[PDB]
Amino acid sequence: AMSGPAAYASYVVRGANLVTAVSYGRAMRNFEQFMARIVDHPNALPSVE
Amino acid sequence: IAHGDGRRPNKQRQYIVMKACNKHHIGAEIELAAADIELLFAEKETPLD
DSSP states (O other), X not given: OOOOOSSOOOOOOOTTHHHHHXXXXXXXXXXXXXXXXXXXXXXXXXXXX | OOOOSSSOOOOOOOOOOXXXXXXXXXXXXXXXXXXXXXXXXXXXXXXXX
């Protein structure tokens, strides 16, 4: 008797994802989490925790 | 004008002047896309669509 996910995981191109998708024709995944390592914490080392 | 020399004086006169309209057609052009006529009716999808 295992355990696991009951549903899928979503992916919408709402917000600023849409901008580079429509204009530049290339898109992202998790644009905000992508952004927070550049505009907020740009010096952050690659650490697992 | 009645004038009193030895002409033949002339009687009353009358004219028939016929006028008609003139027809003009004018022809223009619109082309529309394949996909535009297709996706005019979709709905409900992602905020990209």
